[PDB]
Write an enzyme that holds these catalytic residues in place. Structure first.
Site, PDB file in Angstrom:
ATOM      1  N   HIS A 153      36.102  50.098  73.566  1.00  3.67           N
ATOM      2  CA  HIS A 153      37.275  50.638  74.266  1.00  3.67           C
ATOM      3  C   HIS A 153      37.993  49.648  75.189  1.00  3.67           C
ATOM      4  O   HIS A 153      39.057  49.953  75.722  1.00  3.67           O
ATOM      5  CB  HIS A 153      36.887  51.889  75.066  1.00  3.67           C
ATOM      6  N   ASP A 376      44.755  61.640  56.749  1.00  3.77           N
ATOM      7  CA  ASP A 376      44.713  61.958  55.335  1.00  3.77           C
ATOM      8  C   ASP A 376      44.957  60.647  54.619  1.00  3.77           C
ATOM      9  O   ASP A 376      46.061  60.107  54.671  1.00  3.77           O
ATOM     10  CB  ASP A 376      45.772  63.006  54.982  1.00  3.77           C
TER      11      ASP A 376
END
Length: 429
Positions: A153, A376
């Site tokens: 991070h 997707d």
């Protein structure tokens, strides 16, 4: 479970990216040292090219041209401050197989074996020796697949990480970059001279147990991870006991979880308990951050109560404490916070790599508003997305419904015996 690695590739940006050193703001430095894990699960369509690694790697390299710092490494500057060495060294992409089936994960409680679905990183050698991003596609016996994500991070927070994963998937579908990343964290530079205007409770040490707890059983190995569905609802009733104050759905839910955890842990009346709420600063900083801002902007709200009050008063009391801390966090407070951080000698020492999420305290983060099902890659949206194994006790996540189906899920780690009682979760009286 058994993981068989079939392929391991270091994927580099498709074309040449800028060679440069990216500065890190104070919020990009109060960051856990390890890679943050997340996992997606997909059903097979029945097609032979389901999650074709070639399609995945080609689109990954493409996404790494505008998101080039993601393909970089960590280094320190002359003052010893960590920065991103944007050298395009690249991103780890692993392909794996397993005889297990997706259905074995049952409710998708984010248990720790989920970490087997994400590549392992050796932090023992230097900070410059590992990619900021590791990825794994594992094919299950059932024809289904998981995408495992491990991201350091210092690169960016989970919000920018989502931006990258979704962009990657768009490109696998042959689509264009929609929101170009904005790469410059000097927007969160502290003022000079630094001038804090507040005493920042959210950087003070967590309350300890007044009476110390039995280390085990009640440690790492007494910790269960579960997930619970709330089926709508299944904000009201905040009208309990004639209270007129209106609280948001998030405030009521977070208060309820906080309270239920307090009850399940049997906290004494005189015991203080602190709640740590991940709070996105993108909508609060007032020069207003560019869309696609690439970096960390996650601040933390830390309301506190004495358990006597938290657990005997209605849930709206808890929501009220929460609301009071959420409301104070406007630009002026967050600017103050950045200045406070600027004056601390060692930012890494302020990281709650807890330790501090231990009875009596709690962390909660909500991904309800986040586009966690938009990835997707051409074979459909995931049937589940969640943290890739909750590391230790006292951390909880709120997850939106994959089908919506306006349902919510609460994933949480608690001590074994506390977990059973946490079934206090399921009554609004």
């Amino acid at each position: 479970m058994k993981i068989n690695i079939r392929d391991s590739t270091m994927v580099r940006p498709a074309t040449e990216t800028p060679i440069t050193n990216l500065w890190n703001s104070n919020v990009d430095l109060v960051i856990p040292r390890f890679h943050t894990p997340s996992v997606y699960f997909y059903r097979p369509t029945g097609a032979s090219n389901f999650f074709d690694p070639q399609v995945m790697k080609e689109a990954l390299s493409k996404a790494l041209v505008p998101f080039y710092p993601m393909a970089g490494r960590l280094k320190r500057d002359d003052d010893g401050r960590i920065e991103i060495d944007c050298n395009g060294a690249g991103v780890l992409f692993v392909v794996a197989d397993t005889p297990s089936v997706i259905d074995d994960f049952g409710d998708f409680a984010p248990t720790l074996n989920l970490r087997q679905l994400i590549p392992e990183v050796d932090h023992s050698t230097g900070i410059h020796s590992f990619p900021l991003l590791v990825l794994q596609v594992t094919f299950f016996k059932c024809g289904g697949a998981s995408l495992g994500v491990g991201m350091q991070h210092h690169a960016a927070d989970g919000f920018s990480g989502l931006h990258f994963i979704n962009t990657w998937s768009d490109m696998a579908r042959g689509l264009d970059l929609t929101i170009p990343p904005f790469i410059d964290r000097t927007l969160l530079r502290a003022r000079d001279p630094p001038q804090p205007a507040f005493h920042h409770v959210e950087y003070q040490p967590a309350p300890s147990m007044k009476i110390p707890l039995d280390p085990s059983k009640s440690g790492p190995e007494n910790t269960t991870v579960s997930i619970f569905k709330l089926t709508r609802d299944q904000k009201a009733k905040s009208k309990e006991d004639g209270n007129t104050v209106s609280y948001s759905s998030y405030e009521m839910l977070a208060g309820h979880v906080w309270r239920s955890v307090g009850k399940a842990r049997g906290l004494p009346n005189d015991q203080e308990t602190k709640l740590y709420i991940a709070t996105d600063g993108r909508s609060r900083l007032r020069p207003q951050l560019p869309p696609g801002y690439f970096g960390n902007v996650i601040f933390t709200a830390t309301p506190l109560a004495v358990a006597g009050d938290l657990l005997s008063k209605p849930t709206w009391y808890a929501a009220g404490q929460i609301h009071d801390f959420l409301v104070r966090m406007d630009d002026n407070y967050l600017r103050s916070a950045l200045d406070y951080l600027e004056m601390q000698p060692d930012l890494s020492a302020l990281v709650r790599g807890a330790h501090t999420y231990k009875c009596p305290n709690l962390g909660i983060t909500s991904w309800v508003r986040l586009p966690i099902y938009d990835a997707d890659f051409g074979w459909g949206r995931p049937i589940f997305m969640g943290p890739g194994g909750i590391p230790y006790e006292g951390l909880s996540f709120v997850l939106p419904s994959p089908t919506n189906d306006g349902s919510l899920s609460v994933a949480i780690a608690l001590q074994s015996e506390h977990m059973k009682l946490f079934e206090k979760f399921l009554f609004e009286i």
